Ligand binder design. Structure first.
Ligand SMILES: N[C@@H](CCC(=O)N[C@@H](CS)C(=O)NCC(=O)O)C(=O)O
Ligand SMILES: N[C@@H](CCC(=O)N[C@@H](CS)C(=O)NCC(=O)O)C(=O)O
Lengths: 215, 215
């Protein structure tokens, strides 16, 4: 059997999961879920995710939610010697995958996402005005985060060490949409961070998932 | 050598780390960091965490930050057959540790923390007024989250299955402080969730870390 990813393909936390499936060479199917008719809150979907949110995943009789959990089960399940992206076979490396995965979720995303969810995902999706207050602020916040990212990505090819990893792939979905805003040119001031970004956009798995993220 | 946890012991993300050390039987030391004199932003501390936040950890020459990453490196490092709390030896079990760990960070904590950080951690720590708006709202939000927790903890002794796990321990630190507010009696309406809470408070490792969380 293939395994099943439930949500719209456009969606960032879907793309986390789909990218991980592409990277690892997995048979998979994407089942839409129609926000506009509350399918995410429908009882079918609540049996996948009791909290009524996308994505959900099913591998036969196993039902998972929370894109990061899904992603890790996919990364351990289809692991090869050729494609170890969580590095659990090395403790110290596995730690620096955890750190930078956690940095994305707790530092970077909370400073980047609100600019995406204001320039792009507010008028084009929800038809809601853009808050210059929240934007100017997360933009200042993100310049300082990219200061730390620059330092790191000047010492290492990737966030976790000198190997692509789950830490890096996590950063792709929301950054992809960042790069569709006027603010994308921000990375031009962070040339190490930029080179690392251009590296990720060069991978056959990313080129593919990128193709799935349009209106 | 022992390993080193940097921040105040009172702090929730310190306690995540310290609890995990106690559970697993590890030699460790807690090095205070004095918020009041900006030690968390001092250059010594920035060499641990470049983002200037607690906790940080050092195991000899390894420097980690982000309590969840720290916690997992501690849980893999000191793992016994007697104390497997991430269950990486079982995929399906490891997935349901990831899910409920992610639920804490993305559903539960964001609905609980703002009541803690308003009734307790605002006037007693920052000397800041309590926002009835934000409280009433996260309280309604949390009642519905505890609906899902009740369902689950009526089917299973613990969040991940019929075994204590990293998912459960994650929920301890902020819930501990929840239980010091007027709102603690909320759990009385969620008797399964309550029994699971009383179970966690009964473990020798939790009784110990609880002792460290006072003014
Ligand atoms: N932490 C989750 C994020 C889930 C999420 O962002 N949920 C959104 C996706 S657009 C949603 O379905 N929100 C609708 C709602 O809960 O009302 C993950 O890692 O997948
Ligand atoms: N996601 C982090 C949370 C870190 C955190 O909450 N930082 C606080 C701890 S009280 C802090 O030091 N804030 C000060 C600042 O960054 O200005 C973890 O898992 O440890």
């Amino acid at each position: 059997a293939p395994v099943k990813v439930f949500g719209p393909a456009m969606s960032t936390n879907v793309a986390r999961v789909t990218l991980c499936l592409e990277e690892v060479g997995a048979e998979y199917e994407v089942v839409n879920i129609d926000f506009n008719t509350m399918e995410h809150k429908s009882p079918e979907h609540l049996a996948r995710n009791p909290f009524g949110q996308i994505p959900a995943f099913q591998d036969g009789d196993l039902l998972l939610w929370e894109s990061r959990a899904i992603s890790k089960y996919v990364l351990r399940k289809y692991k090869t010697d050729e494609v170890d992206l969580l590095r659990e076979s090395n403790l110290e490396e596995a730690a620096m995958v955890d750190v930078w995965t956690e940095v994305d979720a707790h530092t970077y995303n909370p400073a980047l996402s609100p600019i995406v969810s204001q320039c792009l995902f507010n008028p084009m999706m929800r038809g809601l005005p853009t808050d210059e207050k929240v934007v100017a602020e997360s933009l200042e916040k993100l310049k300082k985060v990219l200061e730390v990212y620059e330092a790191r990505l000047s010492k290492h090819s990737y966030l976790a060490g000198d190997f692509v990893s789950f830490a890096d792939l996590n950063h792709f979905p929301y950054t992809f949409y960042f790069m569709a805003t006027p603010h994308a040119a921000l990375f031009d001031s962070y040339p190490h961070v930029k080179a690392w970004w251009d590296r990720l956009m060069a991978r056959p798995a990313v080129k593919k998932i990128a193709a799935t993220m349009v209106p």
